[PDB]
Write a protein that holds these residues in place. Sequence first.
Motif, PDB file in Angstrom:
ATOM      1  N   UNK A  38       0.812  -1.173   0.000  1.00 17.44           N
ATOM      2  CA  UNK A  38       0.000   0.000   0.000  1.00 17.44           C
ATOM      3  C   UNK A  38       0.872   1.260   0.000  1.00 17.44           C
ATOM      4  N   UNK A  42       1.375   4.009  -2.815  1.00 19.98           N
ATOM      5  CA  UNK A  42       1.187   5.439  -2.483  1.00 19.98           C
ATOM      6  C   UNK A  42       2.364   6.268  -2.884  1.00 19.98           C
ATOM      7  N   UNK A  45       2.015   6.931  -6.447  1.00 20.43           N
ATOM      8  CA  UNK A  45       1.008   7.965  -6.635  1.00 20.43           C
ATOM      9  C   UNK A  45       1.629   9.331  -6.367  1.00 20.43           C
ATOM     10  N   UNK A  46       2.390   9.507  -5.306  1.00 16.82           N
ATOM     11  CA  UNK A  46       3.000  10.802  -4.982  1.00 16.82           C
ATOM     12  C   UNK A  46       4.043  11.141  -6.024  1.00 16.82           C
ATOM     13  N   UNK A  49       2.228  11.933  -9.734  1.00 16.77           N
ATOM     14  CA  UNK A  49       1.651  13.267  -9.671  1.00 16.77           C
ATOM     15  C   UNK A  49       2.735  14.324  -9.712  1.00 16.77           C
ATOM     16  N   UNK A  50       3.945  13.910  -9.374  1.00 21.28           N
ATOM     17  CA  UNK A  50       4.976  14.900  -9.117  1.00 21.28           C
ATOM     18  C   UNK A  50       5.737  15.363 -10.354  1.00 21.28           C
ATOM     19  N   UNK A  58      11.824  13.114  -0.628  1.00 22.28           N
ATOM     20  CA  UNK A  58      10.722  14.063  -0.378  1.00 22.28           C
ATOM     21  C   UNK A  58       9.400  13.353  -0.653  1.00 22.28           C
ATOM     22  N   UNK A  59       9.360  12.367  -1.586  1.00 24.48           N
ATOM     23  CA  UNK A  59       8.099  11.683  -1.798  1.00 24.48           C
ATOM     24  C   UNK A  59       7.659  10.826  -0.601  1.00 24.48           C
ATOM     25  N   UNK A  62       6.481  13.060   2.257  1.00 21.92           N
ATOM     26  CA  UNK A  62       5.061  13.408   2.117  1.00 21.92           C
ATOM     27  C   UNK A  62       4.153  12.282   2.575  1.00 21.92           C
ATOM     28  N   UNK A  65       4.024  12.148   6.319  1.00 19.69           N
ATOM     29  CA  UNK A  65       3.307  13.296   6.927  1.00 19.69           C
ATOM     30  C   UNK A  65       1.856  12.967   6.730  1.00 19.69           C
ATOM     31  N   UNK A  66       1.361  12.427   5.614  1.00 22.85           N
ATOM     32  CA  UNK A  66      -0.074  12.204   5.539  1.00 22.85           C
ATOM     33  C   UNK A  66      -0.568  10.968   6.298  1.00 22.85           C
TER      34      UNK A  66
ATOM     35  N   UNK B  38      -6.515  18.945   7.316  1.00 20.50           N
ATOM     36  CA  UNK B  38      -5.604  17.853   7.189  1.00 20.50           C
ATOM     37  C   UNK B  38      -5.332  17.547   5.712  1.00 20.50           C
ATOM     38  N   UNK B  45       1.970  18.916   1.259  1.00 15.29           N
ATOM     39  CA  UNK B  45       3.035  17.930   1.372  1.00 15.29           C
ATOM     40  C   UNK B  45       3.256  17.266   0.018  1.00 15.29           C
ATOM     41  N   UNK B  49       6.889  18.193  -2.079  1.00 13.13           N
ATOM     42  CA  UNK B  49       7.737  17.084  -2.491  1.00 13.13           C
ATOM     43  C   UNK B  49       7.854  17.028  -4.000  1.00 13.13           C
ATOM     44  N   UNK B  50       6.899  17.655  -4.667  1.00 14.28           N
ATOM     45  CA  UNK B  50       6.775  17.421  -6.095  1.00 14.28           C
ATOM     46  C   UNK B  50       7.647  18.319  -6.965  1.00 14.28           C
ATOM     47  N   UNK B  58      -3.404  16.430 -10.284  1.00 16.50           N
ATOM     48  CA  UNK B  58      -2.679  15.166 -10.048  1.00 16.50           C
ATOM     49  C   UNK B  58      -2.285  15.103  -8.575  1.00 16.50           C
ATOM     50  N   UNK B  66      -4.302   7.646  -1.862  1.00 20.42           N
ATOM     51  CA  UNK B  66      -3.774   7.113  -0.616  1.00 20.42           C
ATOM     52  C   UNK B  66      -4.771   7.107   0.548  1.00 20.42           C
TER      53      UNK B  66
END
Lengths: 151, 151
Positions: A38, A42, A45-46, A49-50, A58-59, A62, A65-66, B38, B45, B49-50, B58, B66
């Motif tokens: 998972x 994720x 996904x980060x 999108x980036x 940094x990914x 993030x 942090x979430x 949140x 975040x 990072x992106x 995105x 996530x």
Amino acid sequence: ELPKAAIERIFRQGIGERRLSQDAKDTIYDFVPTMAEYVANAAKSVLDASGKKTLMEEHLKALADVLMVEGVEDYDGELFGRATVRRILKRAGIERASSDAVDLYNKLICRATEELGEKAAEYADEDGRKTVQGEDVEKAITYSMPKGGEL
Amino acid sequence: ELPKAAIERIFRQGIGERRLSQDAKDTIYDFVPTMAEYVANAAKSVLDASGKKTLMEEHLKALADVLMVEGVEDYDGELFGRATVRRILKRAGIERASSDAVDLYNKLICRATEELGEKAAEYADEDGRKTVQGEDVEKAITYSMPKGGEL
Ligand SMILES: [Cl-]
Ligand SMILES: [Cl-]
């Protein structure tokens, strides 16, 4: 695949001196690899999108942090093998990663597992038990993860 | 700030024909703005990072994937006002966003609220009740969100 012995040691880092029942181990063996996957998905996904193809620290920062996983960067417990966790990332679609990204993914999933052990320990305490049981782990998963841990 | 009347309508979109108690409304008034914040911080975040300064669709799609919020893109219920949700994003540090990013953030928080109503409805069903009560909402928060919804 993540070795069960390593899953157990890492989870047990969060339970102090408490005992760990077999149904608790059963729970964590099923859950930790699903959580790791998972988290790797994720991470993809980060990064998709980036706009980058290389996974970087940094990914994963993030994601930590979430998911609100504490103490990831400072984690100094047992880690899985780099190649194993890199292969989980590769299966999630991560073609390219930096070494620091891999290490932070590893600290994230390990710290998340240890944190689960802490939470399970807290539920055993609530019931005045010395042993962490499958129900404590189940409650820790449901409480701490999105979608009840159905990851 | 998110208006309470809008929070309620949106949550109620997920409870079908069930009644909603005051303690349930109390719960959602406290929770939905905290969840929105949140989510906005998480969006920051995913964008810091992106490597970009502009929030884009995105980035919110990654958060939805996530948090495992279903049906976000297809959400066609009530939305908050664009300026209100843009200000929540601005408070989270989002200096620049595209209109489509703002709209997807809005669909995410609204769909997440509706989904919470569905989950709460499911708990009321479990107890053979027609009215969704604060305990159903509390359980829906804890189950569905990371860290038990302590967001
Ligand atoms: Cl890096
Ligand atoms: Cl966009």
